[PDB]
Symmetry: C2
Subunit: 234 residues, 2 copies
């Protein structure tokens, strides 16, 4: 017996900053372990990259066939497992899937409704669509000070698009985490390290000075805004 | 410099097997243990082990040389068979001398019953090794608030800031301290009482009628308010 729920969570943490991406993959995997059976036959992963999610997925789930996708063949350097390299928005999906899973990749998509339609057509009845992406305040400090950043869907955008694509929402949540760095230069070092070129001295100095607007008692904020979703073909 | 403080807020919608609420809390705490704690911890003291919902997860994911299990009631021992590396410390944890030289003190869904948490945290500090771990789940003030309002029965719970201040006072650094307020939405008030009996927690018609004050769009609310903590003895 499943019951609907709504929740609010809040707290503080004191953790490594270089592992944010893997931590998001761990949080998505922890959700998979709830909603999904331990055994699955056919899984398709969109945008596997280095495999931060892939490692956790095979460790927690018994898969018989795993299809991995990413834009570039260079990711296979980091690696019953098939590969489909290319733009997922034009690739032929593997068909008759038990689950489509994707961590931190859908924010790069040009036409999300059309991609969701292809996800719906490729999944079995009651097939799983499970993903993490990011919401409108992801890296908001960087967008405010540099003018660069993606335009992100909010939670209601996703709720609407998933419903029109024919999916049942089992979990849909937004999390907002402020990391507090000791100095503005530590923020840029973090972004350079985690993979998110030299700037001019003037741009750098203006950036450091403008970052005073994000100073807290704990430090200078950098915001991550992941969205987590467990959905089902209805 | 590799560690940064952070603050977070999460919100969303979900579905849960309502019967698994206490097991889910144990799993959530165990996930935090796995994130923060080393895989091997020689000496571990569990407070309020009960039937072992947290104990089984702890032994599964951590290499423990001496596991000291406490509960108020000896009856909990019936839920364990041929448990390995265990020392039993049956009794009121608020009166018992703690085991010495601990690598971790851990507790799931038991601290809400404590009559004197500040003194307990002092005993935790004294029993732990240098930078030893104190890791627990408990509940906050909105836990089962609908049942407290309608029946008058319920505990007084510490809030998150109470814990923050008490841990720092007792000599612990806080690696993780968080709360989740979750409203479960049942189809009818009858289903709320069935859930409560299954999980182990004129008047009946008045209870059903009184539950109208908790009617939402999704159904009739029952709130759980778990609190999770990863802490370490300050060097
Ligand atoms: N249109 C696209 N088709 C396929 N892969 C894409 C597309 N756009 C971006 N990607 C990949 O999406 C990945 C996104 C990265 N944030 C890595 C995600 C990876 N799952 C992880 O969490 O480690 C990169 O490997 C991109 O190359
Ligand atoms: N003063 C006390 N000293 C020791 N154990 C206690 C005390 N008060 C309550 N308990 C135990 O705390 C436990 C709380 C229960 N919610 C079970 C928790 C258990 N860790 C579980 O996850 O199943 C019960 O077994 C109680 O008997």
């Amino acid at each position: 017996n499943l019951v609907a729920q709504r929740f609010a969570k809040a707290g503080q943490s004191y953790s490594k900053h270089a592992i944010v991406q893997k931590q998001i993959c761990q949080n998505l995997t922890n959700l998979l372990k709830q909603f999904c059976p331990s055994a699955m036959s056919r899984v398709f992963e969109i945008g596997c990259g280095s495999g931060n999610l892939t490692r956790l997925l095979v460790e927690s789930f018994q898969i018989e066939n795993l299809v991995l996708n990413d834009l570039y063949a260079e990711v296979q350097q980091h690696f019953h497992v098939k590969w489909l390299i290319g733009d997922v928005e034009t690739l032929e999906f593997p068909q008759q899937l038990d689950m489509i899973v994707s961590g931190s990749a859908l924010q790069w998509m040009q036409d999300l409704p059309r991609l969701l339609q292809h996800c719906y057509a490729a999944l079995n009845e009651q097939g799983w669509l499970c993903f993490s992406t990011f919401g409108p305040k992801n890296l908001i400090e960087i967008k405010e000070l540099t003018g660069q950043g993606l335009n992100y869907w909010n939670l209601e955008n996703w709720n609407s698009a998933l419903t029109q694509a024919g999916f049942e929402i089992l979990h849909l949540a937004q999390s907002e985490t402020q990391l507090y760095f000791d100095s503005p230069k530590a923020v840029l070092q973090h972004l350079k390290a985690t993979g998110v070129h030299r700037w001019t001295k003037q741009s750098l100095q203006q950036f450091y000075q403008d970052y005073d607007r994000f100073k807290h008692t704990e430090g200078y904020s950098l915001t991550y805004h992941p969205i987590y979703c467990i959905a089902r073909r209805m």
